[PDB]
């Protein structure tokens, strides 16, 4: 088998992650077509159709059956490197693969930072509002 951390590089693992994905047979954003685009299904309560690139970590809710997940990926995250991987996985080299994984680990960190930032600006707003009300 393949080291679990490295698993989302696998189209078939990514597919397997779609569990009760609403858009099946007749749709353009089918789990197959979705995994092919690098998404994994990571549903929440308020967001049951939440999908995420395993590589750039962009997150997209609000899918419509006519959406082409590739086109939708170039749109909301053109910078993503997986988008450029022409080759099929096992056609890669370990060298090429490790380059890619390093970039993933970097994008992940980049994403963590980015969230911590929003969390920070959220807390700020609360503090601002409070102080204002307290001065009023």
């Amino acid at each position: 088998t393949l080291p679990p951390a490295w698993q989302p590089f696998l189209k078939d693992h990514r597919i397997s992650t779609f569990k009760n994905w609403p858009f099946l047979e007749g749709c353009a954003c089918t789990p197959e077509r979705m995994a092919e685009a690098g998404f994994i299904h990571c549903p929440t309560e308020n967001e049951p159709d939440l999908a995420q690139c395993f590589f750039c970590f962009k997150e997209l809710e609000g899918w419509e059956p006519d959406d082409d997940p590739i086109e939708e990926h170039k749109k909301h995250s053109s910078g993503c490197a997986f988008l450029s991987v022409k080759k099929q996985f096992e056609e890669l080299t370990l060298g090429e693969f490790l380059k890619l994984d390093r970039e993933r680990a970097k994008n992940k960190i980049a994403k963590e930072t980015n969230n911590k930032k929003k969390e920070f600006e959220e807390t700020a707003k609360k503090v601002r509002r409070a102080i204002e009300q307290l001065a009023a």
Binding site: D49, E59, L60, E61, G62
Partner: peptide
């Protein structure tokens, strides 16, 4: 689709 919010 949309970029996630909140």
């Amino acid at each position: 689709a949309r970029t996630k919010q909140t």
